[PDB]
């Protein structure tokens, strides 16, 4: 039922043609505008019908420049004006009517308008505009003192016919603009079907009514439910007194802006509770069981970014690169680190990379092909920029495949992959990095997984004896599995317990 | 199954240079540490430099850190010596031999045959056999490869049937600066006469390729 | 840079004997020592890793131990073909230093040569030289005196020996002398002889011909 309106003003485009035809694919069939209706320069020889069946408009409706005769908004009941023209104005009737020809706009057929919950109405410069002058429009206003203005209108105008009682939008004996305001008992805070005490509206009637229940509102005061007017859609889940907690109520349904439904639009997902376009700045799409649903991202959505080398244009992360990867989380492909890279080159005049703009890595988590360092800026002894990152995949390979490949590094002194878990599938080298320890008791069987037997090569980094002497060894709180680096942050798994990330005693 | 083979040693001028093979069989360079070797005739070993095949990294002995350039070729299967400003001191059987997989150690768990490499100014020359004869139980017989450079000799007897009791003694090399050396067998006195024998000798260096009949006479 | 030191240079053991080679390394290595086996002109077998480890398709007889700076080698039921040149080395990081080689040689029951003299060739004649050989074969132990004699008188300088290395299966030696002269001065002397003496003989045995 439900369809969006317009924001466009008084902009238009040169054909009235296109005019036309483009304001009938929006209001398409439509019983609610979500939005404004904005009916401006229309052709003249328009054959508006796709109009009848809308009850509401969310907005305000803007009837300007155009030629047709009447106005065919029979089951037009409220207008909400939640939003306004100009200002103060939900209805915005002005100039219709042209020179060269009698196209012009004689009547409203607004026979079913009953209220109109916030703004006014302006009413002037339609030539032949008839009857308007008639109209009790302080009957229809809810708003004490929204601008009522009407002028300047029809000059010759018939009379109302006598069963109208000299109210009505047009001539005919059905015609007849119907009163809404009776003034009311104290108990009906202004919401009232009849001047009785005991005849007031129901507490979710947004604005009058016609009995004191929910489906007799002429407007829900917050959600529409299949006739009735609610303050919530039903919810998700119900409370089940058979397992003592919560679960998924079937009949649940959704918001979307006043209207409960029981699926979201072809465009449109869900987030906890409404319908809403695009997920907020900290959900993903996430398809499960028949349902696309906005779920929290907690620390960020992954924002997947480009990787490098076999199918990227760079070979290298270099100082005209870096910038394209801030906040971003997983990575499609690979990540080289070239000697060129960092220090750049001035013969194909590259500049050199700034070292604390590394860092950006740090939000890195997971990296779907290879890592290859093969230089790293010297004040810096360890990887502690891919801190955070967690997987590598390997689903692209580096040389005769290696999926990770760390080498000709001499500063370096440990690694710190401190959350890195799985290394999925590849081989790994990490060979002639003359400073690295702490590598030698990590446990690669953990880490890895398939084969163990001829995927390791690591040697010729500092031996063993000297990095046991210097005393660089596992925190004595490390598993057997090794470490990463020294200190209780960079076990692979505790033997006690683990307060974020970093290895207790109690 | 798995094995090296190298090639390429032989005579070289002093300060020339040369390129050294180690063809690799039964596994896969990439990943595996090349290592080269060497070894003076009478003394031990020495290391000169190694080579993983995946990165390229090499490293090398001072000993020879910057003449020499140890590379390979991945898709080839290969390694190689590159021998450059070779002196006089550098005369020495020179090994490939990969790394070992078990542990972060240098072990060096198979190795090539050995390619030979002497360096000296002196000219190429060809071997002289002669026939040692017998007669003059059990008797002996043999060859004589005498006034040969450079080291070294192949002698084998009938093409390789006779194996039993053969010794081929090491050169000497003699006041001349010539080599030359002694290969004998033993065979049972009724053989000869019926038996033939022959010493098949090979001498690569100058491209000798003799076979001398060695019978006793009358 | 590192040194090895292996002790001692050769050695001599019977069959069954247990025997221990040591190498002393200048600065600790903790456990970072290989190993290696090589015999006459072949490559050098791999024995031991990591100061104590044995290589698969070594048999358990040899054994390593040792750590810092003290490493032992130890073959515990000797054999013929465990005849070899045994080489400790560090492998911590490079440049890998070898020690400088425990030769090995087997001791057995004292074997006599049997003594082989062969005149020079009417063909090595004619080129204007002569070469006398005298042939030591499958003896033990290695030390033997090759003295020529050129008509009873003794000669000195013109020879030449050449040692076979030990066989390895019935752990015997073998020898060549060779006596080289100008035939000028060959084509002057009727009787050649090569004396040999050794400790499992008696009387020296003699070997001549005449020309
Ligand atoms: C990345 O940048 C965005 C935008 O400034 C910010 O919201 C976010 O906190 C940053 N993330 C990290 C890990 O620094
Ligand atoms: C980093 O320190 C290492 C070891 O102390 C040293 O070899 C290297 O030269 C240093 N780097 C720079 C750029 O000074």
């Given at each position: 039922?439900?369809?969006?309106?317009?924001?466009?003003?008084?902009?238009?485009?040169?054909?009235?043609?296109?005019?036309?035809?483009?304001?009938?694919?929006?209001?398409?069939?439509?019983?609610?505008?979500?939005?404004?209706?904005?009916?401006?320069?229309?052709?003249?020889?328009?054959?508006?019908?796709?109009?009848?069946?809308?009850?509401?408009?969310?907005?305000?409706?803007?009837?300007?420049?155009?030629?047709?005769?009447?106005?065919?908004?029979?089951?037009?009941?409220?207008?909400?004006?939640?939003?306004?023209?100009?200002?103060?104005?939900?209805?915005?009737?002005?100039?219709?009517?042209?020179?060269?020809?009698?196209?012009?706009?004689?009547?409203?057929?607004?026979?079913?308008?009953?209220?109109?919950?916030?703004?006014?109405?302006?009413?002037?410069?339609?030539?032949?505009?008839?009857?308007?002058?008639?109209?009790?429009?302080?009957?229809?206003?809810?708003?004490?003192?929204?601008?009522?203005?009407?002028?300047?209108?029809?000059?010759?105008?018939?009379?109302?016919?006598?069963?109208?009682?000299?109210?009505?939008?047009?001539?005919?004996?059905?015609?007849?603009?119907?009163?809404?305001?009776?003034?009311?008992?104290?108990?009906?805070?202004?919401?009232?079907?009849?001047?009785?005490?005991?005849?007031?509206?129901?507490?979710?009637?947004?604005?009058?009514?016609?009995?004191?229940?929910?489906?007799?509102?002429?407007?829900?005061?917050?959600?529409?439910?299949?006739?009735?007017?609610?303050?919530?859609?039903?919810?998700?889940?119900?409370?089940?007194?058979?397992?003592?907690?919560?679960?998924?109520?079937?009949?649940?349904?959704?918001?979307?802006?006043?209207?409960?439904?029981?699926?979201?639009?072809?465009?449109?997902?869900?987030?906890?509770?409404?319908?809403?376009?695009?997920?907020?700045?900290?959900?993903?799409?996430?398809?499960?069981?028949?349902?696309?649903?906005?779920?929290?991202?907690?620390?960020?959505?992954?924002?997947?970014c480009?990787?490098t080398?076999?199918?990227?244009?760079?070979?290298t992360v270099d100082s005209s690169n870096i910038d394209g990867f801030v906040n971003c989380?997983?990575?499609?492909?690979?990540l080289d680190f070239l000697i060129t890279g960092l220090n750049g080159?001035?013969?194909?005049?590259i500049p050199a990379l700034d070292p604390e703009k590394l860092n950006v890595f740090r939000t890195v988590?997971?990296?779907?092909?290879?890592?290859?360092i093969?230089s790293w800026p010297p004040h810096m002894h360890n990887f502690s920029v891919f801190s955070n990152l967690?997987?590598?995949?390997?689903?692209?390979?580096?040389?005769?495949?290696?999926?990770?490949?760390?080498?000709?590094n001499?500063n370096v002194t440990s690694?710190g992959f401190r959350?890195?878990?799985?290394?999925?599938?590849?081989?790994?080298?990490?060979?002639?990095?003359?400073?690295?320890?702490?590598?030698?008791?990590?446990?690669?069987?953990?880490?890895?997984?398939?084969?163990?037997?001829?995927?390791?090569?690591?040697?010729?980094?500092?031996?063993?004896?000297?990095?046991?002497?210097?005393?660089?060894?596992?925190?004595?709180?490390?598993?057997?599995?090794?470490?990463?680096?020294?200190?209780?942050?960079?076990?692979?798994?505790?033997?006690?317990?683990?307060?974020?990330?970093?290895?207790?005693?109690? | 199954?798995?094995?090296?083979?190298?090639?390429?040693?032989?005579?070289?001028?002093?300060?020339?240079?040369?390129?050294?093979?180690?063809?690799?069989?039964?596994?896969?360079?990439?990943?595996?540490?090349?290592?080269?070797?060497?070894?003076?005739?009478?003394?031990?070993?020495?290391?000169?430099?190694?080579?993983?095949?995946?990165?390229?990294?090499?490293?090398?002995?001072?000993?020879?850190?910057?003449?020499?350039?140890?590379?390979?070729?991945?898709?080839?299967?290969?390694?190689?010596?590159?021998?450059?400003?070779?002196?006089?001191?550098?005369?020495?059987?020179?090994?490939?031999?990969?790394?070992?997989?078990?542990?972060?150690?240098?072990?060096?768990?198979?190795?090539?045959?050995?390619?030979?490499?002497?360096?000296?100014?002196?000219?190429?020359?060809?071997?002289?056999?002669?026939?040692?004869?017998?007669?003059?139980?059990?008797?002996?017989?043999?060859?004589?490869?005498?006034?040969?450079?450079?080291?070294?000799?192949?002698?084998?007897?009938?093409?390789?049937?006779?194996?039993?009791?053969?010794?081929?003694?090491?050169?000497?090399?003699?006041?001349?600066?010539?080599?030359?050396?002694?290969?004998?067998?033993?065979?049972?006195?009724?053989?000869?006469?019926?038996?033939?024998?022959?010493?098949?000798?090979?001498?690569?260096?100058?491209?000798?390729?003799?076979?001398?009949?060695?019978?006793?006479?009358? | 840079?590192?040194?090895?030191?292996?002790?001692?240079?050769?050695?001599?053991?019977?069959?069954?004997?247990?025997?221990?080679?040591?190498?002393?390394?200048?600065?600790?290595?903790?456990?970072?020592?290989?190993?290696?086996?090589?015999?006459?002109?072949?490559?050098?077998?791999?024995?031991?890793?990591?100061?104590?480890?044995?290589?698969?398709?070594?048999?358990?007889?040899?054994?390593?131990?040792?750590?810092?700076?003290?490493?032992?080698?130890?073959?515990?039921?000797?054999?013929?073909?465990?005849?070899?040149?045994?080489?400790?080395?560090?492998?911590?990081?490079?440049?890998?230093?070898?020690?400088?080689?425990?030769?090995?040689?087997?001791?057995?029951?004292?074997?006599?040569?049997?003594?082989?003299?062969?005149?020079?060739?009417?063909?090595?004649?004619?080129?204007?030289?002569?070469?006398?050989?005298?042939?030591?074969?499958?003896?033990?132990?290695?030390?033997?005196?090759?003295?020529?004699?050129?008509?009873?008188?003794?000669?000195?300088?013109?020879?030449?020996?050449?040692?076979?290395?030990?066989?390895?299966?019935?752990?015997?030696?073998?020898?060549?002398?060779?006596?080289?002269?100008?035939?000028?001065?060959?084509?002057?002397?009727?009787?050649?002889?090569?004396?040999?003496?050794?400790?499992?003989?008696?009387?020296?045995?003699?070997?001549?011909?005449?020309?």
């Amino acid at each position: 039922a439900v369809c969006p309106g317009t924001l466009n003003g008084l902009s238009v485009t040169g054909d009235a043609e296109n005019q036309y035809q483009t304001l009938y694919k929006l209001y398409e069939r439509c019983e609610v505008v979500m939005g404004n209706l904005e009916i401006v320069l229309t052709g003249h020889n328009a054959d508006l019908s796709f109009l009848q069946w809308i009850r509401e408009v969310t907005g305000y409706v803007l009837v300007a420049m155009n030629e047709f005769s009447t106005l065919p908004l029979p089951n037009l009941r409220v207008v909400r004006g939640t939003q306004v023209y100009d200002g103060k104005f939900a209805i915005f009737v002005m100039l219709n009517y042209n020179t060269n020809s009698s196209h012009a706009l004689r009547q409203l057929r607004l026979t079913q308008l009953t209220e109109i919950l916030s703004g006014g109405v302006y009413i002037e410069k339609n030539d032949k505009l008839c009857h308007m002058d008639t109209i009790d429009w302080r009957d229809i206003v809810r708003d004490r003192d929204a601008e009522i203005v009407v002028k300047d209108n029809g000059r010759s105008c018939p009379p109302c016919h006598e069963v109208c009682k000299g109210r009505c939008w047009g001539p005919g004996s059905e015609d007849c603009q119907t009163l809404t305001k009776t003034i009311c008992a104290p108990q009906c805070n202004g919401h009232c079907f009849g001047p009785n005490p005991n005849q007031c509206c129901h507490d979710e009637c947004a604005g009058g009514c016609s009995g004191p229940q929910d489906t007799d509102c002429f407007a829900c005061r917050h959600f529409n439910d299949s006739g009735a007017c609610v303050p919530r859609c039903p919810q998700p889940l119900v409370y089940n007194k058979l397992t003592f907690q919560l679960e998924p109520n079937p009949h649940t349904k959704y918001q979307y802006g006043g209207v409960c439904v029981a699926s979201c639009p072809h465009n449109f997902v869900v987030d906890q509770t409404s319908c809403v376009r695009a997920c907020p700045p900290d959900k993903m799409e996430v398809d499960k069981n028949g349902l696309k649903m906005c779920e929290p991202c907690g620390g960020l959505c992954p924002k997947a970014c480009e990787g490098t080398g076999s199918g990227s244009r760079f070979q290298t992360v270099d100082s005209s690169n870096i910038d394209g990867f801030v906040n971003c989380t997983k990575i499609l492909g690979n990540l080289d680190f070239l000697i060129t890279g960092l220090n750049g080159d001035p013969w194909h005049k590259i500049p050199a990379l700034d070292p604390e703009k590394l860092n950006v890595f740090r939000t890195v988590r997971e990296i779907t092909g290879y890592l290859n360092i093969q230089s790293w800026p010297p004040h810096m002894h360890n990887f502690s920029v891919f801190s955070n990152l967690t997987t590598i995949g390997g689903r692209s390979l580096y040389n005769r495949g290696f999926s990770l490949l760390i080498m000709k590094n001499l500063n370096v002194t440990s690694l710190g992959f401190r959350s890195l878990k799985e290394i999925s599938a590849g081989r790994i080298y990490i060979s002639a990095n003359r400073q690295l320890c702490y590598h030698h008791s990590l446990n690669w069987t953990k880490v890895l997984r398939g084969p163990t037997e001829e995927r390791l090569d690591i040697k010729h980094n500092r031996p063993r004896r000297d990095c046991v002497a210097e005393g660089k060894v596992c925190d004595p709180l490390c598993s057997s599995g090794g470490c990463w680096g020294p200190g209780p942050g960079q076990c692979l798994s505790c033997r006690n317990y683990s307060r974020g990330g970093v290895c207790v005693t109690h | 199954e798995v094995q090296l083979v190298e090639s390429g040693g032989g005579l070289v001028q002093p300060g020339g240079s040369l390129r050294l093979s180690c063809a690799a069989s039964g596994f896969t360079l990439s990943g595996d540490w090349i290592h080269w070797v060497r070894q003076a005739p009478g003394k031990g070993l020495e290391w000169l430099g190694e080579i993983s095949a995946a990165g390229g990294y090499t490293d090398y002995a001072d000993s020879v850190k910057g003449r020499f350039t140890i590379s390979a070729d991945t898709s080839k299967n290969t390694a190689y010596l590159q021998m450059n400003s070779l002196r006089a001191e550098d005369t020495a059987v020179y090994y490939c031999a990969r790394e070992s997989r078990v542990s972060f150690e240098a072990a060096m768990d198979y190795w090539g045959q050995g390619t030979l490499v002497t360096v000296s100014s002196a000219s190429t020359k060809g071997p002289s056999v002669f026939p040692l004869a017998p007669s003059s139980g059990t008797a002996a017989l043999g060859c004589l490869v005498k006034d040969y450079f450079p080291e070294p000799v192949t002698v084998s007897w009938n093409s390789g049937a006779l194996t039993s009791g053969v010794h081929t003694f090491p050169a000497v090399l003699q006041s001349s600066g010539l080599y030359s050396l002694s290969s004998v067998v033993t065979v049972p006195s009724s053989s000869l006469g019926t038996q033939t024998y022959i010493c098949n000798v090979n001498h690569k260096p100058s491209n000798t390729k003799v076979d001398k009949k060695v019978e006793p006479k009358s | 840079d590192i040194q090895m030191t292996q002790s001692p240079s050769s050695l001599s053991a019977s069959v069954g004997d247990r025997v221990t080679i040591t190498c002393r390394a200048s600065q600790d290595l903790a456990t970072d020592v290989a190993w290696y086996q090589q015999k006459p002109g072949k490559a050098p077998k791999l024995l031991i890793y990591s100061a104590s480890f044995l290589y698969s398709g070594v048999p358990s007889r040899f054994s390593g131990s040792g750590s810092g700076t003290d490493f032992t080698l130890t073959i515990s039921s000797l054999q013929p073909e465990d005849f070899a040149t045994y080489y400790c080395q560090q492998s911590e990081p490079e440049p890998y230093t070898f020690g400088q080689g425990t030769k090995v040689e087997i001791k057995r029951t004292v074997a006599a040569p049997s003594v082989f003299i062969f005149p020079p060739s009417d063909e090595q004649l004619k080129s204007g030289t002569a070469s006398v050989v005298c042939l030591l074969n499958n003896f033990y132990p290695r030390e033997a005196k090759v003295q020529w004699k050129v008509d009873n008188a003794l000669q000195s300088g013109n020879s030449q020996e050449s040692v076979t290395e030990q066989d390895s299966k019935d752990s015997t030696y073998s020898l060549s002398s060779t006596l080289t002269l100008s035939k000028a001065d060959y084509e002057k002397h009727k009787v050649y002889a090569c004396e040999v003496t050794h400790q499992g003989l008696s009387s020296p045995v003699t070997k001549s011909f005449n020309r």
